[PDB]
């Protein structure tokens, strides 16, 4: 009755894992490798296509992770290796015009450094932050001396994130989930096809996710398994919270030649008084923001429970503190003032919350050991303004008879930051060949 | 006029009108990563074309064959298949028989070629 008919160009697909390439419109995020983007993207709405997405099993995240680390490392290949600096340092405290918080935070160090000629030496006096220097009682060494060589970041290369678009190869397509209130790990009734993602800025931070996308209707709580306290919870806000960060001290930067065409940059002195670095959020915005987060948490933790926020429990400074790059400087801000509250169902000025911050010049990124970067000091005074777009929270374990849940800031695993931008994308392979019965018979001779 | 995969979700009998829309988008260090992606796209394209060649469908997007449809692959009538299903749904329904159908298509073409060769030798 019916015969097999072969069709080619059939609109079907399968989940697939392939290699994606970058595209974009000096900087660490070099655009030297990336394909210039198209004048405009296209988006095809797919009516009546319901598809299943899983943000926690998404290989786009792993590729972004590998590419970001690769670009990071490539940018340091031509930079000065500061191995002549791993010497005994003679250090005393900076006591000149220091405020109450800046006590022992800066040390004035002196050492015998190499110079252009091998038979010559020079005496160098520089200021260091305490966190970068470890005592050996005036004898100190840099903290990286017993684990790694340190490379000076090149002074002319910016650390400002540049949006990167990921693009699929021919034969593949990226499906985008357009649903609002999509938490990942589900069917998505409204989808469309794109060839490239929106530009994603590789902003690096812990605890608070800066400069990402916002939810349009409600705060969205996302997790791999919400009842597993070992998992992180990502929270996407529907409004930005503005945060104002500064490094108030006016620095004078000096440099010396330490070899044949190589130079080291260091803080020479501080022009004015010495103050602590800090970040501000308004109280009203932060307090409204948490109320919104709490209402949504109650969906998973219902029956009028008590929701408490608390400080990070411990670990390396990177995880317990809010890490970010502000104008090229590396800040570690204390968020204990943001996560100190108890919420119940019975509830309810330029006043603001000031978060004290510490600064480091020796940076060990991506949780790797054996590599380190020295961040040159920046002359002048630093100020940056960012938008808080989401949070990383963890939940305390405990008995099941508890009426209280406690949430704390988390982070340190960069892949979870990426996941907050890539959650709506899936890569599929196009499978254009297929068969179906028809009444058409091939002519026989 | 719909774009690429625009007909996904439409019925099979509607989607079949856009075969050239999808066909034209096929085939359209760190340099190594990019080359591997390009080489792979070519290899996949060529393998599909090779099957169409083997089955005698080399120049066509729609190709009729001499393999009877088995009710055991899908005991479903034409109205249901062409009007009430999408290609994604169909693909799931018969994914288990893909290699049976392909094997049959190859065998049929081999027999056809031998018959043509002999008819042309009749003199």
């Amino acid at each position: 009755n019916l015969w097999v008919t072969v069709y080619y160009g059939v609109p079907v697909w399968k989940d697939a894992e392939t290699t994606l390439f970058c595209a974009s419109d000096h900087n660490v995020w070099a655009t030297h490798a990336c394909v210039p983007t198209d004048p405009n993207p296209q988006e095809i709405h797919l009516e009546n296509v319901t598809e299943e997405f899983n943000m926690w099993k998404n290989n786009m995240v792993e590729q972004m992770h590998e590419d970001i680390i690769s670009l990071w490392d490539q940018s340091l290949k031509p930079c000065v290796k500061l191995t002549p600096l791993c010497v005994t340092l003679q250090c005393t405290n900076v006591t000149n015009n220091i405020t109450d918080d800046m006590r022992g935070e800066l040390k004035n160090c002196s050492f015998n450094m190499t110079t252009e000629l091998r038979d010559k030496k020079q005496k160098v006096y520089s200021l260091f932050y305490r966190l970068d220097v470890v005592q050996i009682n005036k004898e100190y060494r840099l903290i990286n001396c017993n684990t790694s060589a340190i490379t000076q970041a090149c002074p002319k290369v910016s650390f400002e994130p540049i949006p990167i678009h990921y693009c699929a190869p021919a034969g593949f397509a990226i499906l985008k989930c357009k649903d609002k209130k999509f938490n990942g790990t589900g069917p998505c009734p409204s989808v469309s096809t794109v060839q490239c993602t929106h530009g994603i800025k590789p902003v690096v931070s812990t605890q608070l996710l800066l400069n990402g996308s916002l939810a349009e209707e409600e705060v969205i709580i996302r997790s791999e398994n919400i009842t597993n306290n070992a998992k992180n919870i990502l929270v996407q806000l529907n409004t930005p919270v503005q945060i104002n960060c500064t490094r108030p001290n006016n620095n004078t930067v000096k440099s010396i030649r330490i070899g044949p065409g190589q130079a080291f940059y260091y803080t020479g002195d501080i022009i004015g008084d010495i103050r602590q670095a800090h970040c501000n959020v308004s109280k009203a915005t932060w307090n409204e923001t948490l109320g919104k987060v709490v209402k949504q948490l109650r969906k998973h933790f219902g029956n009028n429970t008590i929701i408490r926020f608390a400080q990070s429990s411990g670990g390396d400074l990177e995880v317990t503190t809010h890490s970010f790059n502000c104008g090229g400087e590396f800040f570690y801000c204390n968020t204990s003032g943001l996560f100190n509250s108890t919420w119940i169902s019975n509830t309810s000025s330029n006043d603001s919350i000031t978060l004290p911050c510490r600064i480091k010049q020796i940076i060990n990124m991506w949780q790797r050991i054996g590599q380190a970067m020295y961040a040159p000091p920046i002359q002048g005074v630093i100020r940056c303004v960012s938008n808080i777009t989401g949070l990383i929270l963890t939940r305390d374990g405990g008995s099941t008879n508890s009426t209280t849940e406690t949430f704390r800031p988390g982070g340190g695993d960069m892949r979870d930051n990426w996941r907050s931008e890539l959650y709506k994308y899936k890569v599929v392979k196009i499978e254009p060949l297929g068969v179906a019965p028809t009444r058409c018979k091939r002519r026989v001779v | 006029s719909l774009g690429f995969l625009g007909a996904a979700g439409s019925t099979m009998g509607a989607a079949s009108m856009t075969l050239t829309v999808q066909a034209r988008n096929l085939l359209s260090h760190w340099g190594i990563k990019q080359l591997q992606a390009r080489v792979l796209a070519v290899e996949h394209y060529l393998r599909d074309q090779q099957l169409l060649g083997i089955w005698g469908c080399s120049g066509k997007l729609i190709c009729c064959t001499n393999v009877p449809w088995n009710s055991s692959w899908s005991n479903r009538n034409l109205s249901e298949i062409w009007d009430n299903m999408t290609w994604l749904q169909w693909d799931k329904e018969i994914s288990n028989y893909t290699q049976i159908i392909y094997g049959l298509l190859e065998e049929s073409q081999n027999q056809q070629e031998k018959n043509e060769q002999d008819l042309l030798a009749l003199d």
Partner: antibody, heavy 123, light 108 residues
Framework: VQLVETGGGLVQPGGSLKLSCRAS????????MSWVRQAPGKGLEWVSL????????FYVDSVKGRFTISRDNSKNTLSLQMHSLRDGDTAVYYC??????????????????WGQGALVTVS | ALTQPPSVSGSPGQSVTISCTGT?????????VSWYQQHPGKAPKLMIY???QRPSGVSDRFSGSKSGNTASLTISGLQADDEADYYC???????????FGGGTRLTV
């Protein structure tokens, strides 16, 4: 469902007449259509067939050199242009639905919905 | 044309068989032999299609069958209104599409 015929009446031999059929109550474009004629003292004779799209036409040998069948789906209209009319072409012509279907449709080798016809006289 | 006997008749309440005869290429080769009826002054109505199928609106007193190169329509329970002319029609192939038979004028 209705099929309504309008068109020419009496012509002298060697002349030309055109018939038109309009129809409604169904999707016009889903069906193939045909003209059948009945001489005043005779039974039924098939004259022509057109597919649903309008690209394929078939004729009875007797009219191959003189009749054209065409359709325009946007106006739900079927038509027949007759040239070089003979006395032997006097008949009531009827439009009807069916006689063919596409490869993705169930077989439909019969006519089902008929119009009431129009009389064509050649004298 | 297909052969179809003229003037086949019977009394009300009886059954009648109206046969149709073709050749091996017309009836013997294809199971597409429809039947139509026509009241004077009206366009024909489809009564049977394929061989044994009946369209909605047609009662079950009308049924067909075939054997060899012939086919038939039987009407059981003849009614007062069953006095239409009947015709058989079959699909003959690609070169010749349809062949109609002669008519039968049924009376009761």
């Amino acid at each position: 469902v209705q099929l309504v015929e309008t068109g020419g009446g009496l012509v002298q031999p060697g002349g030309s007449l055109k018939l038109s059929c309009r129809a409604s109550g169904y999707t016009f474009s889903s069906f193939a259509m045909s003209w059948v004629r009945q001489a005043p003292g005779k039974g039924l004779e098939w004259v022509s067939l057109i597919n649903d799209r309008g690209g394929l036409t078939f004729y009875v040998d007797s009219v191959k050199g003189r009749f054209t069948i065409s359709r325009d789906n946007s106006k739900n209209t079927l038509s027949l242009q007759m040239h070089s009319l003979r006395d032997g072409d006097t008949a009531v012509y009827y439009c009807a639905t069916g006689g063919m279907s596409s490869a993705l449709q169930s077989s439909k080798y019969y006519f089902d919905f008929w119009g009431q016809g129009a009389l064509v006289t050649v004298s | 044309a297909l052969t179809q006997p003229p003037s086949v008749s019977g009394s009300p309440g009886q059954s009648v068989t109206i046969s149709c005869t073709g050749t091996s290429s017309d009836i013997g080769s294809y199971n597409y032999v429809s039947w139509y009826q026509q009241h004077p002054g009206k366009a024909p109505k489809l009564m049977i299609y394929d061989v044994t199928q009946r369209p909605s609106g047609v009662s079950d007193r009308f049924s067909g069958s075939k054997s060899g190169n012939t086919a038939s329509l039987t009407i059981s329970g003849l009614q007062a209104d069953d006095e239409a002319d009947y015709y058989c029609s079959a699909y003959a192939g690609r070169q010749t599409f349809y062949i109609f038979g002669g008519g039968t004028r049924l009376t009761v």
